[PDB]
Amino acid sequence: NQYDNDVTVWSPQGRIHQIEYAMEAVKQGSATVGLKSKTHAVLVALKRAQSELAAHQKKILHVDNHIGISIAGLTADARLLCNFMRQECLDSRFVFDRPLPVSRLVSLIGSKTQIPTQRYGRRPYGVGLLIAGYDDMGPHIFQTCPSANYFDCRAMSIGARSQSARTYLERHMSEFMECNLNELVKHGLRALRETLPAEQDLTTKNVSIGIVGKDLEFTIYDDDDVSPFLEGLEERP
Amino acid sequence: NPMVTGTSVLGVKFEGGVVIAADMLGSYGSLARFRNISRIMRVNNSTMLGASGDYADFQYLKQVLGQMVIDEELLGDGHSYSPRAIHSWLTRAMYSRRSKMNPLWNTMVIGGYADGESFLGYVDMLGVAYEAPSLATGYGAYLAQPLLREVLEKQPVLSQTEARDLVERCMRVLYYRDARSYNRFQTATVTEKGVEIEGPLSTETNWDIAHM
Amino acid sequence: YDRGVNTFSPEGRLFQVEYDIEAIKLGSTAIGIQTSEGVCLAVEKRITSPLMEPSSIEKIVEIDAHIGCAMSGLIADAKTLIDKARVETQNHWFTYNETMTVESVTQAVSNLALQFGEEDADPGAMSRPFGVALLFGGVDEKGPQLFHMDPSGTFVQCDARAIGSASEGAQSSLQELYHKSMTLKEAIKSSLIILKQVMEEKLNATNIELATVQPGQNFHMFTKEELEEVIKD
Amino acid sequence: SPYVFNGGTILAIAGEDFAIVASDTRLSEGFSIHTRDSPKCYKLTDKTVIGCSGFHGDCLTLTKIIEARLKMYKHSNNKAMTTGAIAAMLSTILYSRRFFPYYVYNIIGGLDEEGKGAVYSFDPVGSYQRDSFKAGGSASAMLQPLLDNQVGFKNMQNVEHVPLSLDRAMRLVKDVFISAAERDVYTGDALRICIVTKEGIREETVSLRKD
Amino acid sequence: GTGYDLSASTFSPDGRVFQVEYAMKAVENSSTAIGIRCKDGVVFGVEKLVLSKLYEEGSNKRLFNVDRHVGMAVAGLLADARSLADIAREEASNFRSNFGYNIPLKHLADRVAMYVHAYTLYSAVRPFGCSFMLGSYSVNDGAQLYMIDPSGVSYGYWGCAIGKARQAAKTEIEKLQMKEMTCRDIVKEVAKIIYIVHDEVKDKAFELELSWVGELTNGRHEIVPKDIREEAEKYAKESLK
Amino acid sequence: TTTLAFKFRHGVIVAADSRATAGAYIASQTVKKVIEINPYLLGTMAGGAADCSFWERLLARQCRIYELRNKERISVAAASKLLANMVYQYKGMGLSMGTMICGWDKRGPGLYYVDSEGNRISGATFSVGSGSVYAYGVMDRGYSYDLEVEQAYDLARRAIYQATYRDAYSGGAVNLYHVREDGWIRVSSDNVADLHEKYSG
Amino acid sequence: SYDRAITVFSPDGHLFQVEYAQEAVKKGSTAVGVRGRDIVVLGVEKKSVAKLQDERTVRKICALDDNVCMAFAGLTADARIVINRARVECQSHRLTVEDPVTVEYITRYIASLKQRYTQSNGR
Amino acid sequence: TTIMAVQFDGGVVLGADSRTTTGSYIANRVTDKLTPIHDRIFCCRSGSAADTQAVADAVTYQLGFHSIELNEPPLVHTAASLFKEMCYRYREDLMAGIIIAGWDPQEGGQVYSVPMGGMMVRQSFAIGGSGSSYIYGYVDATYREGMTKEECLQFTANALALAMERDGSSGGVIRLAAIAESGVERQVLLGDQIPKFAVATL
């Protein structure tokens, strides 16, 4: 009742309650998924209900010709970190004349987000990120939390009721490393189709898709261009 | 105001690799004070550098580049620097420092060997940067570049030995018709294996013209 | 208080912003809709005495000849972002010699919402957020557009929005009376009848302010006599 | 000194549905030659192109600034930048360093938003204007009169006002650059041309005199 | 205690800075990260638990290369530990830039401990929650092992057992001869230790990390090859039963 | 350079030339020296073009912001004062400027002259450039508040042409403007090679 | 320096410091204003007899310039500060622009001041 | 000024003159140009005296403070690098031309030079000052590998003397110092102790 107001006091059990409270926010928005294959990486977002309290939201952003992101919490902090990443990449390209890798960018993100978790009157960024890119070392998918602890993942989902998507993903894993673009996209869609409340099936006006790889500069797909990808889907059992 | 200076530097690229050459002398004005110092370094396994002009600023850049490479070789991510990035960093450093009227009196020559592709750069005190299959600083631009150009205009595919011998020849000519030189020069190479440096060398010389 | 300002609750939501959004519902009602040939904006004025000439009560302003705005909530904190909007528009016209879109304006204006903190925060900065809801509107390269804002930096495009105290009745009665091929006349008539429905006074000919933006003409704020011909019905 | 003279000339021409930007490919300093391969034309978009001459170190760091600003505009506004906006931005970029300026003469070429041709000339401080033809550089004085005569029909009598084409302008610029090499020393060793039209961009290279 | 535990600038009646006990209580909930030093180098045996196996093999790395000749093994929060790694890297780079030779270990330990202890006095900061260990080897001097707690103490050891199993693991290092055997025939002891100490019902699975420094690596701190990790794991699995 | 301006019964008249040199080399011969600041005010270029353009584009920005904030159009005196005060901060650094602000307000017509040194003065007849002395002499014989628009046009043309016939750094074309109570309008862009025939030349 | 976020929100917006300030204004020598076709009048009531007082020192009404005036009904020191700053601004304006001020101008200035002090830190 | 430093197997030897000048007038004729920095490390000042004294004092302070912590005798490279940085960060305001010499338990006797620029080179022997130009040829024709202690002592003495006859900005007393593992030994030469060379006469 007294350790739950500042980001500095430790609890007798070795926990900081405020960072838990922040993480509780990322698990309030709509779900998002990200995955990768031998030579391609995919991100998918699930704009909800499209007319009421969520009329038209954007959950995918362009960071650079080989890096994109998808957000899962607050939006102002998201734009802040996005601008941060853009400036860092532009500085690398201006200095060395070469694209910045992904792991180093994630390191910088963690270093920046860890500071406010120590000093007074501050609060940590209440946004969870799912990052995708392709460097000389192949494709890469990363996960970032409010607490400055980043993970590398083969396939990860973040948002409301994403546990079912976690189960599904862990189910059909070995099928990866061999499927092409359309196959990976259909996999991701069939995966995030589980979060829904057994109703309000997918449409062409709710899904957003971003795709990257060895021959793509992180292309985006608007509402109208998903239709060619939406076909091939069976009815929910 | 530079006090202890260095003279010309040479660089030429053969097939699959590059070679560089530089003497050993920290001349103070018109005095041969230091005679066993090296003006060539080794950044990493696929990049090497050479400097002219003041020798202290060269040491400063040497220290900074070494620390940069060390900071890179700690994390472990499969990435690394390539001669292009070193070249760009150097050019930007020189430009930014000159825009404040506190330049670095040096003239840099960069070699390298990336995946199947070579490199050979040029950097000046003002930020002038370009590439070419051959180049030279100081008086080497008047007495050495012409020979190299005349040799490439008829054969733009050179082997290791050809480059080595041509380098020795131009160094001999510099020693003949230059006043701030010395007969102790190193000759460095970079192949697909790595970087290698040959010890102190000396050239052959003839003076029979003195009998007329 | 004993809870700071930059704090989270056990639900993932900040406190001060959840508290300021509870104020917007104490302001006047505003409405904004779009059509294939123009956008309409309307606002109500809650006068308090036969005195206080309403000519001074100004809630619809001009960000530029092709962009307007309407506010609700705390009118005081509202006249801090309008100058920023005008500044940015003119700075853009100066550097690039063209007109600023609507999305860029709204993004620049909303980037200033969550800048606040009891600590240093670059002194001369904000100690708390703005309590205001903004509705923009204008024409640009791609037809007429419309946006919306909230005191958390979460703007969203829309086509027919209504804010204020009774923002539910003016939405449940706005979902069914809209089609993608409506004109300006019927648009304004629907807006005015629903305002009548939600107004507290007898809907005098000067208890409201209105404006329109279409490609041909620029930002044009109606007069008192024009507001007569339309109210005859 | 903080400046150097590297030499270099540039030429640009406009038309009804195309634009042309031609330049040399040589870099010198003093009485000697640094290299014979250093072009000046640079592509920014699929419909606009730029040309720079003067001090190299100043012409090499401005291009990066423009590229970055283009990327940032594209990221912020969700659309690419036209030609006039590019020029209005470059004016301010140059005027920022007014008491410590650059020493580069720029020329922009491309297509107007309508589909027509546009060329903009600049000066090292940031004063620009739209034109039909310009030859900023070391050899401007030799080229401007010939272009005046053969594209404006000045000091001519009973001469029609026929329009210009693509092949005609190409041949004209080629002959011009061929002519200006026998009298200027900072010009030669190559020739480059970039054409921009309603179907994108084309590049061409041509041999010249060595000296 | 009413309010004597809300700040790092308050002594309790008996004399105690509770906020530091409360911090170190965090490392008692992490995995075990023992390390030893026999005659020619150091050896760490960190163990990283398996959670949400969707991750890759090599995420949440807990072994940093602080410098060309020293290595770190952490235990506790990873973010604070990464920050401290950056701190140590900066310290060791500045030392070399100013003097001109590889920093020793005693000075590094002392400096980083001063930095860690700076946070145990004021109320405007939070004590760290990580307790790590540094290891190095040189030719002039020998093998050097250390350890730091969130309070700022630096002592030199022959063997440490940071982690939740601080007890029941140090004992397994006593019977060993941590001063005679060479740096090649101890990987097996460390591995069987961290294997038999692990509980198989309270935790699903884990993965084993290692490191190396000494005369074999010429002072350089590098990972342990896999060809020997195979036989190490075989030895452990055969020795457990 | 060569610019002139004078006000009378039917408003203000402005005129300039269309030449731009760099030493002895004529760089441009189609320049536009009558800056169109707005549909209500006007400017003039002399000295350094970059400055005369930048510091008046900024003035346009500020006048627009003023109109937006205060719901009333700005005057001429306030414009000149703003420009002078914004330019006085750079005294002794290398700025070169000479300009005329022309317009119409509730106080009637308006013509002001400004430069970088700091002096700001009204007037009824102004000429600027390296050929203003040759223009003053002929404008002074023919000026009268009670003139007709056609005669004033002819007078401005004649003055500019006679100034061009003597000054080497002045010539090209003659672009004449005219400001009225409801804005301004462009009149003509005559060429000197054709006036020499119409006139006694 | 000082920064503690004196003014903050509440469960219903309800900035309490402003409510308290206007509750203070709920006292403080009621004033009155009127506007006619030819004349503008404005008065104020004196709370005390205070025979020993020198009236010219305790005046509530004041002047910002030859064209403008003002009254107030709260605290006196804050009012003095506001009046002084408004005088400064009304004199600076006439310097840049060659004409006097209007009433809307100075009123907007005064109100923006109060808003800024309502939103800032330590104030 | 004229300073010289030589290296032998188990230690080193230093040598300097004893004159200071402010034009054509001699302000001092005994000055000491050998400044200890630690128990077994020395220095040799040249150029301006103020700057040399300040730099040497600051280096001594830093080195003592750095050695009292590590609990180990310092090295010569450390002091040389400190000098390098201090004279390179202010190369537009200083005129020092310094030499360093000493002993340490890891490596034997060590010598380094640090001219006005801010460089750092180690060499088998070193010299500095204005009167050195007049002996650049004598140290070259006499040096030989395998020299003992007394040999280095008399060598330094002779070179100093030969530089103090032709130069007007140097002369007086010859100060010497021998450094080794056991300890330090100072020495001073004057009058009939200094060497002499017969003057040429026709």
Curated annotation (Swiss-Prot), chain B:
Please give the residue positions where the record annotates the modification Phosphotyrosine: Y55
Entry's localization field? Cytoplasm; Nucleus
| Keywords, alphabetical | Acetylation, Cytoplasm, Nucleus, Phosphoprotein, Proteasome
Biological process according to GO: proteasome-mediated ubiquitin-dependent protein catabolic process
Cell inner membrane listed as a keyword: no
Query: What's a single GO CC term here?
Result: proteasome core complex, beta-subunit complex
Q: What does this protein do?
A: Non-catalytic component of the 20S core proteasome complex involved in the proteolytic degradation of most intracellular proteins. This complex plays numerous essential roles within the cell by associating with different regulatory particles. Associated with two 19S regulatory particles, forms the 26S proteasome and thus participates in the ATP-dependent degradation of ubiquitinated proteins.
Q: Which family does it belong to?
A: Belongs to the peptidase T1B family.
How is this protein organized at the quaternary level? The 26S proteasome consists of a 20S proteasome core and two 19S regulatory subunits. The 20S proteasome core is a barrel-shaped complex made of 28 subunits that are arranged in four stacked rings. The two outer rings are each formed by seven alpha subunits, and the two inner rings are formed by seven beta subunits. The proteolytic activity is exerted by three beta-subunits PSMB5, PSMB6 and PSMB7. Forms a ternary complex with SMAD1 and OAZ1 before PSMB4 is incorporated into the 20S proteasome. Interacts with PRPF19.
Instruction: Give the protein's recorded name.
Output: Proteasome subunit beta type-4
Q: Which gene encodes it?
A: PSMB4
> What range of the full-length protein does this chain span?
48 to 259 of 264
Swiss-Prot record, chain C:
Entries under SUPFAM superfamilies matching the protein: N-terminal nucleophile aminohydrolases (Ntn hydrolases) (SSF56235)
Phosphothreonine PTM sites in chain numbering: T48
Is Cytoplasm set as a keyword in this record?
yes
- List the transmembrane segments: none
Q: Which InterPro entries match?
A: Ntn_hydrolases_N, Proteasome_alpha, Proteasome_alpha-type, Proteasome_alpha_type_5, Proteasome_asu_N, Proteasome_sua/b
In the record, Phosphoserine modifications are located at: S9, S49, S56
Q: Which UniProt keywords apply?
A: Acetylation, Cytoplasm, Glycoprotein, Nucleus, Phosphoprotein, Proteasome
Which GO terms of the cellular component aspect does the record hold? cytosol; nucleus; proteasome core complex; proteasome core complex, alpha-subunit complex
Subcellular location(s) of the protein: Cytoplasm; Nucleus
Q: Report the glycosylation sites.
A: S191
Give the GO biological process terms. Answer: proteasome-mediated ubiquitin-dependent protein catabolic process
Domain of life (superkingdom): Eukaryota
- CDD domains recorded for this chain? proteasome_alpha_type_5
Subunit text: The 26S proteasome consists of a 20S proteasome core and two 19S regulatory subunits. The 20S proteasome core is a barrel-shaped complex made of 28 subunits that are arranged in four stacked rings. The two outer rings are each formed by seven alpha subunits, and the two inner rings are formed by seven beta subunits. The proteolytic activity is exerted by three beta-subunits PSMB5, PSMB6 and PSMB7. PSMA5 interacts directly with the PSMG1-PSMG2 heterodimer which promotes 20S proteasome assembly.
PANTHER family, per the entry? PROTEASOME SUBUNIT ALPHA/BETA
Which NCBIfam families does the UniProt entry name for this protein?
PRK03996.1
Similarity-based family: Belongs to the peptidase T1A family.
Q: What name appears for this protein in its UniProt entry? A: Proteasome subunit alpha type-5
Q: Whose protein is this, by species?
A: Bos taurus
Originating gene: PSMA5
Swiss-Prot record, chain D:
Which residues does the record list as glycosylated? Answer: S28, S179
Keyword Metal-binding belongs to the record: no
| Similarity remark | Belongs to the peptidase T1B family.
Q: Supply one GO CC term from the record.
A: proteasome core complex, beta-subunit complex
Subunit-structure text = The 26S proteasome consists of a 20S proteasome core and two 19S regulatory subunits. The 20S proteasome core is a barrel-shaped complex made of 28 subunits that are arranged in four stacked rings. The two outer rings are each formed by seven alpha subunits, and the two inner rings are formed by seven beta subunits. The proteolytic activity is exerted by three beta-subunits PSMB5, PSMB6 and PSMB7. Interacts with SERPINB2. Interacts with RFPL4A.
Where does the record place it? Cytoplasm; Nucleus
GO biological process, any: proteolysis involved in protein catabolic process
Where are the Phosphoserine residues found in this chain?
S32, S38, S132
The record, for PROSITE patterns, names: PROTEASOME_BETA_1, PROTEASOME_BETA_2
Could you tell me what this protein is called? Proteasome subunit beta type-1
Major location (coarse): cytoplasm
Q: What keywords are assigned to this protein?
A: Acetylation, Cytoplasm, Glycoprotein, Nucleus, Phosphoprotein, Proteasome
> Gene3D superfamilies from the entry?
Glutamine Phosphoribosylpyrophosphate, subunit 1, domain 1
Q: Which residues carry this modification: Phosphotyrosine?
A: Y120
| Residues with N6-acetyllysine modification | K174
Q: Which InterPro entries match?
A: Ntn_hydrolases_N, Proteasome_bsu_CS, Proteasome_sua/b, Proteasome_suB-type
Nucleus listed as a keyword: yes
UniProtKB/Swiss-Prot annotation, chain H:
- What is catalyzed by this enzyme? Cleavage of peptide bonds with very broad specificity
State the active site. Answer: T1 (nucleophile)
- PTM-bearing positions, type Phosphothreonine: T35
- The EC number of this protein is 3.4.25.1
Q: Which GO terms describe its cellular component?
A: cytosol; nucleus; proteasome core complex; proteasome core complex, beta-subunit complex
Q: Which domain of life is it from?
A: Eukaryota
Q: Does the keyword Protease apply?
A: yes
Keyword Hydrolase in record:
yes
> Which biological process terms from the Gene Ontology are attached to this UniProt entry?
proteasome-mediated ubiquitin-dependent protein catabolic process
Family label = Belongs to the peptidase T1B family.
Q: How does it assemble?
A: The 26S proteasome consists of a 20S proteasome core and two 19S regulatory subunits. The 20S proteasome core is a barrel-shaped complex made of 28 subunits that are arranged in four stacked rings. The two outer rings are each formed by seven alpha subunits, and the two inner rings are formed by seven beta subunits. The proteolytic activity is exerted by three beta-subunits PSMB5, PSMB6 and PSMB7.
- Protein name (database record): Proteasome subunit beta type-6
Look up and give the organism this protein is from. Bos taurus (Bovine)
Per the record, the gene is PSMB6
